[PDB]
Design goal:
It is built from 1 helix and 2 strands, in the order E-E-H. The chain is about 20% helix and about 10% strand. The structure holds zinc ion. It is classed as structural genomics, unknown function.
Length: about 40
């Protein structure tokens, strides 16, 4: 209802908490996080 809803921030990591105005440092940040990730999976 009235919980602010203002000040929309860029890509904010939902694991540690970090905003990334750019669309590069964020995508790359997911690597160090995602312990497992390959072609066979996903
Ligand atoms: Zn993070």
């Amino acid at each position: 209802g009235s919980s602010g809803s203002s000040g929309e921030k860029p890509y904010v990591c939902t694991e540690c908490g970090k905003a990334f105005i750019r669309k590069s440092h964020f995508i790359t940040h997911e690597r160090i996080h995602t312990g497992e990730s390959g072609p066979s999976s996903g």
